């Protein structure tokens, strides 16, 4: 803002998509033993925005003249508790949900072992801190609707995003689909 | 730096391995497949260079789009490209594959295979003579030789 006074600094929330790092992260947490959940994710309300929505928001901000010098904030259509979101992820993926909460000291040795790795501390600990943080609600900043784009619900786009993680677990057993995550709104 | 030297030598090794053993896939749609076979024919035999035709996309490293890519054939071409493991390189042979060629204005022709899959080397010709195709393959080998994957990794 100092260098570019009229720059449009967009402030997006968690972004999910086909090549996401947020949803896919939770999907791959199943590989990492059980499902590590700080406070069982009961203190982390999340509001994920769809990648296509974010991109189109950026484009429209570029096109629209009013966007200049406006700190836009991209928020997801709904807010979910971390537990709810992770549960829905494991449901659409049909992966066995093994949520073990993380006591600070007890799982701190696990985090220390992750850091002890001679390579990066498993994408640093700051990523785990991000997981250990609910999305800020900043209504003063303009949102997607201000640009005209309407945020697509996660539930509709979750299937596409997490079908890649869907394995014979769902391929062999078509069964039925799952139910939307609990919305803390 | 010593680390940079080790990284550079390792990247030289892997690039040499990949360019020496280039396994194109048996993918020929139209006329240019004939000149491709003539490249495989004894006169310009590609096997000397390590170029061996392997049918399996999963066991193949380069895709040669030899022929006109129709709208009906395009999804299959994309699928076979995606099933191909990486590192993967695409060589477009023929004016038809490069930009549509003779049938550029046809309703049923994709105006170039670059629209469907990324292309590394474009071989002009209609048909490109087998020597031109061998030249394009060797140019692809030089392109692999110039790759600096491990150097970029070390610089991060």
């Amino acid at each position: 803002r100092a260098a570019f006074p009229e720059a449009t600094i967009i402030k997006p929330s968690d972004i999910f998509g086909r090549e996401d790092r947020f949803l896919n992260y939770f999907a791959s947490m199943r590989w990492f033993g059980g499902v590590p959940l700080i406070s069982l994710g009961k203190e982390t309300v999340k509001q994920p925005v769809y990648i296509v929505d974010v991109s189109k928001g950026i484009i429209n901000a570029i096109k629209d003249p009013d966007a200049k010098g406006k700190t836009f904030a991209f928020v997801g259509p709904n807010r979910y508790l971390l537990f709810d979101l992770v549960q829905y992820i494991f449901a659409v993926a049909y992966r066995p949900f093994l949520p073990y909460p993380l006591p600070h000291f007890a799982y701190r040795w696990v985090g220390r072992l992750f850091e002890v790795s001679p390579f990066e501390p498993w994408t640093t600990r700051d990523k785990v801190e991000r997981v250990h943080m609910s999305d800020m609600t900043l209504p003063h900043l303009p949102g997607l609707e201000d640009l005209g784009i309407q945020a697509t619900p996660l539930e509709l786009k979750a299937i596409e995003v997490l079908r890649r993680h869907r394995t014979y677990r769902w391929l062999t057993s078509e069964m039925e689909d799952v139910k939307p995550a609990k919305t803390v709104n | 730096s010593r680390g940079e030297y080790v990284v550079a030598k390792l990247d030289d090794l892997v690039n040499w391995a990949r360019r020496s053993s280039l396994w194109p896939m048996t993918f020929g749609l139209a006329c240019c497949a004939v000149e491709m076979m003539h490249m495989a024919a004894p006169r310009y035999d590609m096997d000397r260079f390590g170029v061996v035709f392997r049918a399996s996309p999963r066991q193949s490293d380069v895709m040669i789009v030899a022929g006109t890519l129709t709208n009906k054939m395009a999804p299959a071409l994309r699928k076979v490209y995606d099933q191909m493991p990486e590192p993967r390189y695409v060589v477009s042979m023929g004016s038809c594959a490069n930009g549509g060629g003779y049938y550029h204005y046809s309703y049923s022709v994709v105006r170039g295979c670059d629209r469907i899959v990324p292309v590394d080397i474009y071989v002009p010709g209609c048909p490109p003579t087998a020597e031109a195709l061998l030249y394009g393959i060797l140019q692809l080998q030089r392109k692999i030789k110039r790759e600096k994957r491990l150097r970029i990794w070390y610089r991060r």
Binding site: - | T26, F27, G28, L29, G67, M73, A76
Partner: protein
Amino acid sequence: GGAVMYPTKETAHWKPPPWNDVDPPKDTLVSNLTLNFGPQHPAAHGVLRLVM
């Protein structure tokens, strides 16, 4: 003439065994596998989607 003498309620619903044979179910043993022969196939000349 019942399927079984002194039939219980559950057995009462059950029909008597057939006179000669059991009626076979609808297939469910074998079918015709459908294969896309080409187009990438070596023998398909590259542009033949032979649905066999």
